[PDB]
RNA sequence: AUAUAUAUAUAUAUAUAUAUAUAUAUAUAU
RNA sequence: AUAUAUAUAUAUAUAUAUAUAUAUAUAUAU
RNA sequence: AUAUAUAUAUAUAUAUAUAUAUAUAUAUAUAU
RNA sequence: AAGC
């Protein structure tokens, strides 16, 4: 899910409200006037005028964006595990976001990336000011390098391909999902790929210990209790970080769920 | 009323000062109380001929209310939620009809409960069923917030007031409190109950039972009725007991009715809670004519809170009210809710007072007493979704370019920063450095105390701990078959006894369970009960905050008991020309996050500890190695101490947030996990941290930011004249600012106003909402002062209300007596009319003194004789032919009060006893030739005295438990406690020395080895009792009652050997025409006379009793008083210093200071209060607000007035008798009604030596 | 702050190497033998034992005092303010007598060159009114805090 | 310390060190004021409206 | 300013402007005889009543 | 009837006090 | 009101024509202290830093003082009375010495 | 014996103020401070008086 | 998902009625 | 001038109605 | 309890002046 | 589940 996705939930998006902020500042009569006022001909905020820009902008964010973001994240968790992007961590903190939180930085000059990107709505300089506002909005925490995420996302799978690239996929594949008795109701949760011995070892685990409530193809569920610990999967058996909820081939039901090792017979 | 007098002739005549009290009449009245029925009480109500002035319209809207359907909905998370129509806060219970959800109850067809079938569809998953059941359960919970059925209180009020007006023994006249015919609340209560009941023959609108509530099937019943009835009965009781003006009571009733006629009763009360204060207290003395104001002085050091009283200063128009007028705000508030009239009469009445006297403060107290006193109740889901969903608004944040590289989780703050955070960082830096340098920090006993501090019998969310540990494949011992709760932190500690810290490291990131508390006139409060490892790792934060509060600022540690607070501070601050500023932080816990505060405090603490602590473990937490990146380019590793390891882990936890677990019992299908950043309320570091940050931010404003943000020279001079060490007092989120009056009068109000605006602006840029009040009044810790007079707030002590947050059933029968006595003492502190209050308290004690029980066809009645209440501290009225109303409730409790009143009326008692044929031949030292041994037995006085000391709670001890599992539990607890081998060696040395020397002198030596046993007993007693334990109660009480006795305890028999001699009265302590406590006035003679004769306690109690002990703090589980008593017993009984050394070694003190303290104690002379504890003599709780110390010192003369007598000689080495006899003199003087009287010792029957031998015999024999 | 941890390190090393260790009970044992009457309001032994309180952790401060001898060029060990009597004391008070005794024994071990003057002025302060001496000027009179010199 | 009674600690060394540090700072402001600032003022002055 | 400074024994200093004025009229100076007469009147009416 | 006042109630008791 | 814009504008022009840069990190490094004197509160090095408050980045006073030399005849630059020691101060107070 | 009646502690400032009006006001010590019957040196109480 | 129609809910504004409070007017009694 | 009753105007509350804006449910068309 | 003398307290009744705020008229700045 |  993109960072800006929360923006267009309101018919007037957050961006035009930010544009209209200018009316609350004395001596500024237009957004262009605001831009030339806040910058010093070298695309640097005056470090004081940006102060009142933040003064005016923060109530808008904390009074409008935060609640809609809260609902958006609450609904988003229902469809299953997702990758969420944001611009400042305080957005997620104030929205009571649930899940692992990562602050990542980049080995580039991000600010220069804006004004070259043509076809902007309110002008590139507005995007620069917006980026400065978000950076000031962020908390005080050291962001790790972005590579720490992509490495986990890719390298285990790429390594495992060197071992499983030849075996029969029927034996060396697995599936974890929510079981619902009335052929039989089953919605996938995690996809597992590993050698035969590893899958066989996985087969005898207490998958029935965790329960959730499934409602209904576009099904969606919600977990009660505690989430699944990572070591239950393995230090082996590289898996999928994200999943989308769907029922494979009719009244709307809210029966129950426990997850089962429906992986395979072989 | 005819049946009332018919049933309670003798009882009313006895408790109204006409006839002598007796046990048999008391029990007859108790039986009559037990024999009534609800409808009988209402028929009795029908017979009061109410007058016209008690009439007022009742809107018809209350009875007719819509359905509950439109007030609820289902969110996208399939959770029941409250639809809001009045704003963000309209999340309380709406006012809706209920009868269409009731299944008729068997054998009680007129009443019913929530439909069980609807419960079935609810548990299936139906939407409408879930809505209906949520509404039903929450309405039941709202109706369950009382102590006992209202009919008991109403009937007791009727019985008490049937006796008519009382005769004042001091004033020699009759009071003029209007009778029930002018009590508007009772008339409203009767009318509403009759209208609801209508033709149906049953009158009770609902029935309150332990299992819950049953509703009357009427089409006019509404969920808002129970709270309305509670408020009306409270007001009716208060009017008759405290002599309130009926005009104000009518306004209170009007407010209650308007609340009922609204969409949500609780929401309405919450939004309108401040009419009475804003219209009477905050707008008082607009035009001032005269009066007195006390002259108090603040001495040095002001850190000591030492104030001395000078006298009275006449007032003048120079000191009229000068704060900004609030007329517009009050009118707007009254208009917005349609109470503009009530505001109109309130203001008009307020303008009428021009002099500062007893009348004005009485009027203010009466006005404040009329506020509603319900416990606001709302479902937990809305509380969570309303309180944890707001975040701080850091309007001016710390620039990101002002941080170093990370050290594990922390990040060092540079010193070039333009932000104000630098001063906060410096303060915490120096605090940590000074803390870590104290040698006591490294003492094993100190660390053991800190570890034991958070090991209590209360919950700790152990389940989440369990699956968190299972998440890494670690199995804890189960302790199967233990008759104790697994959901206690003691259980958690037992399961965590022998695990490495590395294994339990992940446990800090576990979840958190739920916990709620309801308050009066305040939204329900939520709690996060942190688990054991979290409490362990939160230590350095707590220690640093403690150091700051103890040394670098002015901060109190008093509780919410009125006695222990600093009255002198408030009375000094309110008195002109001084002016006070009331500062509070709204949503204080939600305003402290990683963004501004935590990221700075954690870094400061971590850095300010490395030097004084390098390479040392702590609290079981060991040292470790972390990555270093502070300097640019170089990235290295760095060892850290145990405290720094805790800081790293706690920083991780703070950065992540918090994981709250919710299980809404009132809503089927409402349970989830909520991610929040709000600071926990259940941790040990909450209050101290909040106080420290409060003081630091205030000082920063006064020193740097404020001077740099205002230009008016008057404001600059004022601010430069203010410092926190001289003018600011803080505790948590509540703070008080004192503006000392200048030599030209008092500081200009405009300057104060602009300064207040400056603080309001200054609070925002780091996300603190400063709730500031400046109205010429002083408020601190919900204590209210005006012009040096404190105004008790009656509304915050509801007589009938009781906080119940869970769905559990209420307590067994005997428990309610504790609550009743607590109500009596609350009325005592609040200063009600003493005679009426005593009469009413007697009525209640009668109404609750009987209980039916079933013992398997042995249907018996449990009955408490009247004497047990007297032993519990409730004074008598008239007995043994004595004069009425000669005793005061400053009577002590237990043996002391008994001895006092016997000493006062011994001769009359003897003549009465003889005249009734209770005659014997063996002359007695106390009673001559009276046959007391049988009269006391038949009067049940011995029986009542002895059964008043039985534990009225079930003793879950002695349950069957396997030997192996119990010994495993005990050894696990001991292993957890005894970590460092040094402490174990110390305790072993102490045990060996004690066996060598101190064995055989006393039987119960406190020791660290007994802590596991006490912890096990406490955990076991925390479990739910069962039926056979209640049967054990019943049979024990019957055994005690049926038995026959021959004497009191040894201590009381010793006390009766002493007789005194009253003399001329004392000298007045304060001026007789100076109002100090509202209501304590000439119409309230006895409290007034006691206060003016003894004088108020002008020094805070916490610091006074801090010096009345040897060890300041001990391990949680042991009592410091027990250790002091054991030491003084050992010294008194002639044991040598090695025994005291052994005793000090058991509690873990190191050998050298053990010897030093033992020798010093042996040769030292101790205070009277500290020395009197050897015989369990404690200062009565009611005396705390009086200057008892000077009366101990210079008004209890142990030498007879006529000169030395033969028997009054104290043996030279028995000087502690000098300490004991002072308490006896104090009890005798304070028990008597009237002024304090100089008292002289008269005679001891057996001589001093015999009394000493008896006391030593008791001292040795106890503990068996 | 830059030099103090060095002194703690040296103290730890000294404690590791030295054969001297605290006698746990010597003071109490020798003071438990003095003869006195139980009828007296005051007891010298009580007061002295109360002021001493030998917490056994005192050898750390003793060791840092020893280590200070090697660095009088940059570090000047002095007696803290809190050790002196609060208001200046009085010879008639037993407590002040014991405080003077403690200071008199403690002072000669510090590296402060101005120590003897403070040792003298400590008694001079307690002795005011009882017994007088000529001082230099009106500022540093006989009633100044001894630590001011 | 003839004029600072009531200082229980001898702050002579600390005050002397701080004053010495302030004395010998590498502040180039006096250089600028003595040399360049008059030149800047002279250049600017004729162009002013006042 | 002279009178106020002298009356406060120099502990507080007040200042007056030094420039051409507007001839403000501030009548406050009277002879000693009038003060003595008023003092006698005051002592007279207060006389003999505590 | 006879609802006289509260201030007079206060003063009447005091007047009882002062009498001797 | 007439004078104010002239002095403000000349101050700005001098500020951004001169090669001189005001950098308080020089002071901070020279003092080279965070908070000395672990236990006893008196620490002159910290006190002088607190009084100076180097972290502030506004220096309009300096430029305005320089600009005032051109208009000696109509405007007089003086030190605000608030910068003087409180109540005249005393030599016994450490803060008064730094003032 | 040092605790004053009503703990007034105010006669000191009044006595200082009286120095300015000795023409019309003569501050005196009340009778109640003297011993009732004149006292006796054999009584310690009278010595303190 | 968009457009249109009907029902329901919320906010603002206006009007009427009832109740309460304030002001004005009339009558009886003093 | 006081007490009692009634009427009009203003304010608050409740109900009804109308208009505008927004949303939910049902149906038709694409 | 009756009569007389002295004194305190409550209730009823009567007058002036001033100041503050709001509103109307006139003008300046921003907007139309 | 139910804190300090």
Distance from CA of B800 to the nearest CA of C (A): 52
Using DSSP, state whether B294 is helix, strand or coil: strand
> CA B99: distance to chain centroid?
38
Q: Closest residue of G to C5, CA-based?
A: G38
Cα–Cα separations (whole angstroms), residue B240 to B177, B180, B743:
7, 8, 47
Strand spans (E) along B833-945: 850-853, 860-863, 919-924, 928-930
Which run of H or E residues covers position B442?
A: none
Backbone dihedral region of A225: left (phi > 0), alpha (psi from -120 to 50 degrees) or beta?
Answer: left
For chain K, which bases have at least one atom within 7 A of a protein Cβ?
9-10
Q: Closest residue of H to E50, CA-based?
A: H25
Say whether residue B365 is in contact with chain F using an 8 A CB cutoff: no
- DSSP 8-state code for residue B1118: B
Long-range CB contacts (within 8 A, 24+) of A231-234: A231/B471, A231/B472, A231/B473, A232/A205, A233/A190, A233/A192, A233/A202, A234/A194, A234/A198, A234/A202
Question: Do residues B574 and B777 make contact, with C-beta atoms less than 8 angstroms apart?
Answer: yes
Most H CBs within 10 Å, among B295, B299, B310, B1068, to test the H interface: B310
Which one of D2, D5, D13 has the shortest CB-CB distance to C144?
D5
Distance from CA of D5 to the nearest CA of C (A): 6
- B461-490 residues near strand L (Cβ < 7 Å): 461-463, 487, 489
Q: Which residue has the tokens 């049940």?
A: B940
Q: Closest residue of H to B311, CA-based?
A: H8
F11 touches strand K (CB under 7 A): yes
B73 touches strand I (CB under 7 A): no
Q: Which residue has the tokens 């006896």?
A: B1224
Using DSSP, state whether A156 is helix, strand or coil: helix
Using DSSP, state whether B1064 is helix, strand or coil: strand
Q: For residue B1048, with 0-12 CB atoms within 10 Å meaning exposed, 13-18 middle and 19 or more buried, which class applies?
A: buried
Count of other CB atoms within 10 angstroms of residue B405: 16
Sign of CA dihedral C101, C106, C112, C113: positive
B79 touches strand L (CB under 7 A): no
Furthest CA-CA distance within chain E: 53
Question: Do residues B1061 and B530 make contact, with C-beta atoms less than 8 angstroms apart?
Answer: no
Question: Do residues A164 and A194 make contact, with C-beta atoms less than 8 angstroms apart?
Answer: yes
The C-alpha atoms of residue C138 and residue E2 are separated, in whole angstroms, by 32
Question: Do residues C144 and C121 make contact, with C-beta atoms less than 8 angstroms apart?
Answer: yes
Using DSSP, state whether H17 is helix, strand or coil: helix
Method in brief:
cryo-EM
Q: Bridge-partner residues for B97, per DSSP?
A: B222
The C-alpha atoms of residue B384 and residue A22 are separated, in whole angstroms, by 36
Contacts of F20 in chain B (CB under 8 A): none
The C-alpha atoms of residue B544 and residue B548 are separated, in whole angstroms, by 6
B123-B127-B130 Cα angle (round to 5) = 50
Per-residue HEC secondary structure of B602-654 comes to HHHHHHCCCHHHCCCCECCECCEEEEECCCCCCCEEEEECHHHHHHHHHHHHH
Do you know the residue count of chain B? 1264
Q: Do D36 and G26 touch (CB under 8 A)?
A: no
Using DSSP, state whether B680 is helix, strand or coil: coil
Q: Bridge-partner residues for B308, per DSSP?
A: B297
The C-alpha atoms of residue B959 and residue B972 are separated, in whole angstroms, by 20
F10 touches strand K (CB under 7 A): no
Is the previous residue joined to B1237 through a cis bond, with omega within 30 degrees of 0?
no
Strand spans (E) along C25-78: none
For chain L, which bases have at least one atom within 7 A of a protein Cβ?
1-4
HSE value, Cβ hemisphere, 13 Å, CA-based, for B991: 10
> CA B841: distance to chain centroid?
21
Cα–Cα separations (whole angstroms), residue B870 to A184, B152, B340, B1232, H16:
73, 21, 48, 15, 54
DSSP β-ladder status, B778-780 and B783-786: antiparallel
Residue B1165 tokens read as: 């002379």
Residue A256 tokens read as: 């129950």
Distance from CA of A72 to the nearest CA of B (A): 10
The C-alpha atoms of residue B372 and residue B768 are separated, in whole angstroms, by 30
Q: Which residue has the tokens 């390479």?
A: B615
Q: Which residue has the tokens 């237990």?
A: B894
HSE value, Cβ hemisphere, 13 Å, CA-based, for G10: 25
The residues near A183 (Cβ < 8 Å, ≥ 6 apart) are none
Question: Do residues A196 and A171 make contact, with C-beta atoms less than 8 angstroms apart?
Answer: yes
Sign of CA dihedral B631, B634, B635, B637: negative
Count of other CB atoms within 10 angstroms of residue A155: 11
Q: For residue B325, with 0-12 CB atoms within 10 Å meaning exposed, 13-18 middle and 19 or more buried, which class applies?
A: exposed
The C-alpha atoms of residue B1205 and residue C83 are separated, in whole angstroms, by 48
- DSSP 8-state code for residue D5: T
Say whether residue H24 is in contact with chain E using an 8 A CB cutoff: yes
Contacts of C60 in chain B (CB under 8 A): 439
Q: Do C4 and G38 touch (CB under 8 A)?
A: yes
Cα–Cα separations (whole angstroms), residue A257 to A188, A216, A224, B663:
12, 12, 10, 19
Q: Which residue has the tokens 């200009």?
A: B748
DSSP β-ladder status, B919-924 and B860-863: unpaired
The C-alpha atoms of residue B300 and residue B306 are separated, in whole angstroms, by 7
HSE value, Cβ hemisphere, 13 Å, CA-based, for B256: 30
> CA C22: distance to chain centroid?
18
Say whether residue B218 is in contact with chain H using an 8 A CB cutoff: no
Which one of F2, F3, F9 has the shortest CB-CB distance to B1083?
F9
Question: Do residues B519 and B376 make contact, with C-beta atoms less than 8 angstroms apart?
Answer: yes
B1058-B1063-B1066 Cα angle (round to 5) = 115
Which value in Å is the resolution of this experimental model? Answer: 3.3
Residue B742 tokens read as: 């200048």
Is the previous residue joined to B301 through a cis bond, with omega within 30 degrees of 0?
yes
Closest to B544 measured CA to CA, from B605, B493, B472: B605
Which one of C39, C55, C60 has the shortest CB-CB distance to B1152?
C55
The C-alpha atoms of residue B946 and residue B1048 are separated, in whole angstroms, by 8
Question: Do residues B226 and B374 make contact, with C-beta atoms less than 8 angstroms apart?
Answer: no
The residues near B97 (Cβ < 8 Å, ≥ 6 apart) are B64, B65, B66, B67, B68, B219, B221, B222, B223
Do you know the residue count of chain A? 266
Q: Which residue has the tokens 């006195």?
A: C36
Question: Do residues B795 and B372 make contact, with C-beta atoms less than 8 angstroms apart?
Answer: yes
Count of other CB atoms within 10 angstroms of residue D1: 12
The residues near B1253 (Cβ < 8 Å, ≥ 6 apart) are none
The C-alpha atoms of residue B357 and residue B1071 are separated, in whole angstroms, by 13
Q: Where are the alpha helices (DSSP H) in A85-146?
A: 89-94, 112-116, 124-137
Contacts of H23 in chain E (CB under 8 A): 43
Sign of CA dihedral H39, H42, H43, H44: positive
Contacts of C80 in chain G (CB under 8 A): 40
Residue B21 tokens read as: 């009290």
The C-alpha atoms of residue A262 and residue B1082 are separated, in whole angstroms, by 85
DSSP β-ladder status, B290-298 and B355-356: parallel
Contacts of C27 in chain B (CB under 8 A): 1155-1156
Count of other CB atoms within 10 angstroms of residue B267: 23
Question: Do residues B849 and B843 make contact, with C-beta atoms less than 8 angstroms apart?
Answer: no
Residue B1185 tokens read as: 């607000």
Which one of B393, B473, B677 has the shortest CB-CB distance to A58?
B393
- DSSP 8-state code for residue B399: P
Q: Do B1083 and F16 touch (CB under 8 A)?
A: no
Whether G and B touch, i.e. at least 3 CB pairs below 8 A, reads as yes
HSE value, Cβ hemisphere, 13 Å, CA-based, for G54: 17
Contacts of F14 in chain B (CB under 8 A): 1073, 1082
B85 touches strand I (CB under 7 A): yes
B341 touches strand I (CB under 7 A): yes
The C-alpha atoms of residue H16 and residue H29 are separated, in whole angstroms, by 14
Residue C47 tokens read as: 């007061």
B514-B515-B517 Cα angle (round to 5) = 155
Residue H45 tokens read as: 């109480």
HSE value, Cβ hemisphere, 13 Å, CA-based, for C102: 20
Q: How far is the CA of B64 from the C1' of J18 (A)?
A: 27
Which one of G40, G66, G92 has the shortest CB-CB distance to D37?
G66
Phi, psi dihedrals of residue B660, rounded to the nearest 5°: -90, 135
Contacts of C148 in chain D (CB under 8 A): 5-8
Rounding to the nearest 10 degrees, give the CA dihedral for residues B765, B768, B769, B773.
-110
Closest to B959 measured CA to CA, from B485, B480, B484, B488: B484
Which one of B426, B704, B720 has the shortest CB-CB distance to G86?
B720
A57-A62-A64 Cα angle (round to 5) = 90
- DSSP 8-state code for residue B1135: -
Residues A194-213 as b or e (16 or more Cβ within 10 Å = b): bbeebbeebeeeebeebebb
Question: Do residues B155 and B1218 make contact, with C-beta atoms less than 8 angstroms apart?
Answer: no
Using DSSP, state whether B900 is helix, strand or coil: helix
Phi, psi dihedrals of residue A86, rounded to the nearest 5°: -140, 175
Q: Do C43 and B1212 touch (CB under 8 A)?
A: no
Q: For residue B2, with 0-12 CB atoms within 10 Å meaning exposed, 13-18 middle and 19 or more buried, which class applies?
A: exposed
Name all protein residues with C-beta less than 7 A from any atom of nucleic acid chain J: B 61, 335-338, 340
Question: Do residues B130 and B668 make contact, with C-beta atoms less than 8 angstroms apart?
Answer: yes
Strand spans (E) along B472-578: 516-519, 522-526
The C-alpha atoms of residue C57 and residue B439 are separated, in whole angstroms, by 7
Backbone dihedral region of A47: left (phi > 0), alpha (psi from -120 to 50 degrees) or beta?
Answer: left
Residue B1235 tokens read as: 């002024």
DSSP β-ladder status, B355-356 and B80-82: unpaired
DSSP count for chain E of H helices, then E strands: 2, 0
Q: Do B1083 and F10 touch (CB under 8 A)?
A: yes
Closest to A26 measured CA to CA, from A16, A18, A37, A17: A37
Q: Do B1155 and C29 touch (CB under 8 A)?
A: yes
B651 touches strand L (CB under 7 A): no
Which run of H or E residues covers position B585?
A: strand B579-585
Count of other CB atoms within 10 angstroms of residue A251: 4
Question: Do residues B1233 and B885 make contact, with C-beta atoms less than 8 angstroms apart?
Answer: yes
> CA B1096: distance to chain centroid?
21
Closest to B89 measured CA to CA, from B375, B378, B299: B378
Measured in Å, how far apart are chain H's first and last C-alpha atoms? 8
Furthest CA-CA distance within chain B: 103
The C-alpha atoms of residue B758 and residue B776 are separated, in whole angstroms, by 19
Question: Do residues G49 and G33 make contact, with C-beta atoms less than 8 angstroms apart?
Answer: yes
Which run of H or E residues covers position E32?
A: helix E32-46
Phi, psi dihedrals of residue B999, rounded to the nearest 5°: -65, 130
Rounding to the nearest 10 degrees, give the CA dihedral for residues C133, C137, C140, C143.
40
Sign of CA dihedral B436, B439, B442, B446: negative
Chain G contacts in chain D segment 1-50 (CB below 8 A)? 3-7, 9, 11, 14-15, 18, 21-22, 25-29, 32, 36-37, 40-41, 44-45, 48, 50
């Amino acid at each position: 899910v993109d960072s800006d996705e929360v923006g267009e939930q309101m018919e007037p998006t957050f961006e035009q409200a930010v544009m209209e902020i200018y009316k609350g500042i004395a001596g500024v009569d237009s957004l262009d006037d605001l831009i030339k006022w806040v910058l010093n001909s070298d695309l640097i905020p005056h470090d004081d005028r940006l102060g009142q820009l933040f003064q005016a902008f923060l109530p808008l964010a904390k009074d409008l964006l935060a609640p809609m973001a809260r609902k958006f994240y609450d609904n988003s968790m229902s469809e299953g595990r997702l990758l969420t992007f944001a611009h400042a961590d305080s957005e997620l903190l104030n929205a009571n976001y649930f899940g692992h939180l990562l602050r990542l930085k980049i080995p580039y000059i991000t600010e220069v990336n804006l004004m070259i990107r043509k076809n902007r709505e309110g002008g590139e300089l507005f995007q620069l000011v917006l980026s400065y506002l978000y950076k000031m909005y962020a908390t005080s925490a050291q962001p790790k390098w972005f590579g720490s995420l992509l490495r986990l996302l890719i390298c285990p799978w790429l390594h495992m391909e060197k071992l499983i690239g030849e075996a029969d996929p029927a034996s060396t594949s697995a599936e974890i999902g929510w079981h619902i008795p009335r052929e039989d109701g089953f919605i996938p949760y995690v996809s597992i790929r590993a050698p035969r011995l590893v899958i066989e070892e996985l087969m005898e685990k207490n998958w029935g210990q965790y329960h959730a409530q499934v409602i209904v193809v576009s099904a969606k569920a919600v977990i009660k209790g505690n989430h699944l610990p990572v070591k239950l999967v393995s230090r082996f058996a590289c898996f999928t970080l994200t999943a989308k909820y769907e029922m494979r081939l009719g009244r709307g039901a809210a029966y129950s769920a426990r997850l089962a090792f429906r992986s395979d017979l072989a | 009323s005819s049946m009332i007098l018919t049933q309670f002739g003798p009882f009313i005549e006895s408790i109204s000062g006409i006839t002598d009290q007796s046990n048999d009449v008391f029990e007859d009245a108790a039986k009559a109380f037990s024999m009534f029925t609800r409808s009988d009480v209402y028929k009795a109500l029908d017979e009061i001929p109410f007058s016209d002035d008690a009439m007022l319209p009742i809107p018809p809207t209350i009875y007719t209310k819509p359905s509950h359907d439109s007030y609820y909905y289902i969110d996208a998370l399939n959770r029941v939620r409250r639809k809001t129509y009045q704003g963000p806060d309209d999340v309380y219970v709406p006012n809706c009809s209920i009868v269409e959800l009731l299944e008729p109850h068997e054998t009680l067809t007129s009443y019913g409960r929530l439909s069980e079938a609807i419960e079935n569809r609810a548990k299936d998953g139906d939407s409408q069923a879930r809505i209906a059941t949520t509404y039903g359960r929450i309405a039941e919970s709202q109706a369950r917030q009382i102590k006992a059925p209202l009919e008991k209180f109403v009937l007791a009020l009727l019985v008490a007031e049937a006796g008519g007006s009382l005769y004042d023994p001091v004033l020699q006249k009759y009071d003029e409190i209007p009778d029930l015919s002018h009590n508007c609340p009772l008339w409203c209560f009767r009318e509403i109950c009759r209208h609801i009941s209508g033709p149906l023959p049953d009158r009770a609108p609902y029935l309150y039972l332990s299992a819950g509530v049953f509703w009357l099937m009427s089409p006019r019943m509404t969920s808002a009725i129970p709270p309305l009835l509670s408020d009306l009965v409270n007001l009716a009781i208060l009017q008759q007991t405290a002599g309130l003006d009926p005009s104000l009571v009518k306004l209170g009733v009007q407010i209650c009715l308007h609340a009922a006629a609204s969409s949500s009763y609780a929401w309405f009360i919450l939004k309108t809670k401040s009419i009475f204060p804003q219209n009477t207290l905050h707008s008082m003395y607009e035009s001032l004519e005269g009066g007195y104001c006390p002259n108090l002085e603040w001495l040095e050091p002001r850190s000591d809170y030492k104030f001395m009283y000078m006298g009275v200063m006449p007032l003048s128009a120079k000191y009229a009210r000068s704060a900004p007028s609030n007329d517009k705000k009050a009118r707007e508030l009254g208009e917005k809710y349609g109470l503009s009239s009530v505001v109109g009469e309130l203001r008009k009445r307020t303008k009428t007072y021009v002099k500062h006297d007893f009348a004005s403060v009485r009027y203010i107290r009466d006005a404040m007493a009329c506020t509603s006193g319900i416990f606001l109740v709302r479902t937990p889901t809305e509380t969570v979704l309303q309180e944890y969903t707001q975040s701080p608004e850091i309007k001016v944040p710390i620039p990101q370019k002002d941080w170093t590289g990370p050290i594990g989780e922390i990040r060092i703050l540079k010193d070039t920063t333009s932000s104000i955070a630098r001063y906060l960082y410096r303060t915490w830096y120096l605090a940590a450095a000074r803390m870590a340098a104290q040698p006591r920090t490294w003492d094993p006993l100190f660390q053991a105390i800190m570890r034991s501090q958070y090991v209590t019998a209360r919950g700790g969310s152990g389940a989440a701990l369990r699956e968190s540990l299972y998440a890494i494949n670690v199995s804890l011992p189960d302790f199967k078959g233990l008759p104790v709760k697994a959901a206690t932190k003691i259980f958690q500690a037992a399961q965590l006894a022998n695990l490495p810290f590395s294994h339990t490291s992940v446990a800090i990131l576990a979840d958190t369970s739920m916990g709620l508390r309801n308050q009066v006139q305040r939204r329900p409060r939520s709690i996060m009960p942190l688990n054991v490892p979290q409490q362990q790792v939160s230590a350095p934060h707590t220690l640093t905050a403690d150091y700051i509060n103890y040394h670098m600022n002015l901060s109190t540690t008093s509780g919410s008991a009125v006695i222990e607070k600093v009255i002198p501070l408030g009375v000094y601050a309110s008195s002109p020309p001084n002016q006070s500023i009331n500062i509070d932080i709204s949503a204080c816990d939600a305003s402290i996050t990683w963004d501004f505060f935590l990221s700075v405090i954690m870094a400061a603490i971590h850095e300010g500890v490395a030097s004084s602590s390098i390479g040392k473990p702590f609290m079981g937490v060991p040292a470790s190695i972390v990555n270093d990146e502070s300097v640019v380019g170089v990235r290295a590793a760095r060892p850290i101490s145990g405290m720094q390891n805790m800081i790293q882990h706690l920083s991780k936890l703070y950065k992540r947030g918090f994981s709250y677990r919710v299980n809404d019992s009132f809503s089927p299908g409402n349970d989830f996990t909520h991610m929040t950043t709000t600071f926990p309320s259940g941790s040990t570091a909450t209050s101290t941290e909040h106080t420290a940050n409060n003081s630091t931010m205030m000082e920063t404003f006064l020193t740097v930011w404020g001077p740099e943000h205002t230009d008016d020279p008057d404001v600059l001079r004022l601010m430069k004249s203010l410092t926190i060490q001289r003018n600011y007092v803080c505790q948590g989120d509540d703070g008080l600012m004192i503006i000392d009056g200048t030599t030209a009068g008092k500081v200009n109000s405009e300057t104060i106003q602009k300064m207040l605006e400056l603080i309001s602006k200054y609070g925002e840029e780091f996300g603190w909402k400063y709730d500031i009040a400046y109205d010429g009044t002083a408020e601190y810790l919900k204590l209210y002062f005006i012009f040096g007079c404190r105004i008790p707030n009656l509304s915050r002590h509801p007589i009938v209300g009781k906080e119940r947050a869970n769905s559990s059933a209420e307590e067994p029968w005997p428990a309610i007596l504790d609550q009743i006595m607590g109500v009596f003492f609350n009325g005592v502190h609040d200063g009600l009319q003493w005679q009426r209050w005593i009469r009413y308290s007697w009525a209640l004690c009668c109404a609750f003194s009987r209980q039916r029980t079933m013992i398997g066809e042995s249907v018996g009645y449990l009955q408490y004789p009247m004497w047990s209440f007297v032993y519990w501290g409730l004074p008598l009225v008239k007995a043994f032919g004595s004069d009425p109303w000669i005793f005061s409730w400053y009577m002590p409790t237990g043996d002391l009060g008994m001895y006092s009143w016997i000493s006062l009326i011994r001769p009359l008692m003897t003549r009465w006893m003889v005249a009734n044929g209770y005659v014997t031949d063996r002359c007695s030292p106390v009673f001559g030739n009276a046959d007391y041994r049988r009269c006391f037995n038949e009067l049940k006085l011995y029986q009542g005295y002895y059964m008043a000391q039985l534990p009225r709670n079930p003793k879950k001890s002695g349950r069957a438990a396997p030997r192996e599992v119990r010994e495993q539990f005990t050894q696990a607890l001991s292993d957890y406690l005894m970590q460092n081998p040094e402490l174990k060696s110390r305790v072993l040395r102490g045990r060996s020395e004690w066996e060598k020397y101190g064995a055989g002198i006393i039987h119960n030596p406190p020791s660290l080895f007994d802590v596991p046993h006490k912890w096990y007993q406490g955990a076991q007693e925390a479990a739910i009792a069962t039926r056979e334990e209640l049967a054990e109660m019943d049979e024990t009480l019957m055994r005690a009652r049926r038995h026959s006795y021959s004497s009191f305890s040894k201590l009381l028999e010793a006390y009766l050997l002493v007789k005194w001699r009253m003399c001329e009265a004392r000298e007045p302590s304060v001026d007789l025409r100076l109002p100090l406590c509202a209501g304590i006035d000439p119409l309230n003679s006895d409290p007034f006379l006691k206060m003016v004769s003894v004088g108020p306690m002008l020094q805070s109690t916490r610091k006074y009793f801090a010096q009345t002990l040897f060890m300041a703090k001990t391990v949680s589980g042991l009592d410091v008083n027990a250790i002091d008593s054991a030491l003084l017993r050992l010294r008194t009984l002639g044991a040598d210093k090695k025994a005291l050394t052994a005793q000090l070694l058991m509690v873990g003190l190191q050998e050298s200071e053990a010897d030093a303290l033992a020798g010093k104690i042996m040769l030292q002379d101790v205070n009277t209060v500290q020395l009197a504890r050897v015989v369990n003599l404690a200062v009565p709780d009611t005396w705390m607000s009086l200057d008892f110390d000077s009366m101990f010192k210079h008004h209890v003369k142990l030498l007879p007035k006529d000169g030395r007598h033969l028997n009054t000689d104290i043996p030279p080495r028995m000087g502690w008798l000098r300490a004991i006899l002072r308490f006896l003199g104090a009890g005798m003087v304070m028990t008597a009604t009237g002024v304090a009287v100089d008292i002289y010792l008269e005679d001891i029957h057996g001589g001093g030596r015999s009394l000493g031998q008896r006391f030593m015999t008791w001292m040795r024999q106890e503990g068996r | 702050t830059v030099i103090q941890p060095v002194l703690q390190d040296i103290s730890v090393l000294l404690q590791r190497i030295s054969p001297l260790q605290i006698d746990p009970t010597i003071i109490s044992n020798t003071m438990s033998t003095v003869s006195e009457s139980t009828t007296q309001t005051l007891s010298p032994a009580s007061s002295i034992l109360g002021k001493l309180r030998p917490s056994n952790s005192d050898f750390s401060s003793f060791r840092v005092a020893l280590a200070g001898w090697l660095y009088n060029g940059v570090v000047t060990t002095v007696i803290d303010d809190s050790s002196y009597p609060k208001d200046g004391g009085s010879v008639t008070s037993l407590e002040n007598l014991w405080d003077f005794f403690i200071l008199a024994l403690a002072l000669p071990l510090t590296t402060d060159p101005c120590a003897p003057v403070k040792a003298f002025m400590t008694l001079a302060n307690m002795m005011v009114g009882f017994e007088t001496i000529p001082m230099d000027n009106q500022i540093y009179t006989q009633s100044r805090r001894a630590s001011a010199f | 310390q003839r004029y600072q009674p009531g200082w229980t600690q001898s702050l002579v060394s600390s005050m002397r060190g701080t004053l010495d540090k302030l004395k010998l700072i590498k502040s180039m402001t006096p250089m600028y004021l003595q040399q360049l600032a008059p030149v800047e003022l002279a250049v600017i002055a004729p162009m002013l409206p006042f | 300013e002279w009178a106020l400074t002298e009356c406060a024994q120099g502990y507080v200093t007040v200042t007056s402007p030094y420039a051409p004025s507007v001839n403000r009229l501030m009548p406050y100076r009277i002879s000693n005889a009038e003060r003595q007469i008023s003092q006698i009147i005051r002592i007279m009416n207060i006389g003999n009543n505590a | 009837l006879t609802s006289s006042d509260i201030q007079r109630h206060i003063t009447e008791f005091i007047s009882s006090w002062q009498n001797h």
